[PDB]
């Protein structure tokens, strides 16, 4: 049986954050990825 091999999702991680004197809360962006495959 013929099977196709595709590498699973990988991509850069970016941290969106206001300056530390403003707040410590951050957000994370996973480039070019299903939101369903993050965990």
């Amino acid at each position: 049986e013929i099977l196709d091999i595709t590498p699973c999702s990988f991509g850069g991680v970016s941290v969106i954050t206001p300056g530390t004197n403003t707040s410590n809360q951050v957000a994370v962006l996973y480039q070019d990825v299903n939101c369903t495959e993050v965990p």
Binding site: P7, G11, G12, Q31, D32
Partner: peptide, 22 residues
């Protein structure tokens, strides 16, 4: 007219074509 893995990644532009048109 203009129509045309191993760590490669293509980042989308900050301004979409719609915003440039606007």
């Amino acid at each position: 007219k203009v129509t045309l893995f191993n760590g490669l990644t293509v980042l989308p532009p900050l301004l979409t074509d719609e915003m440039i048109a606007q």
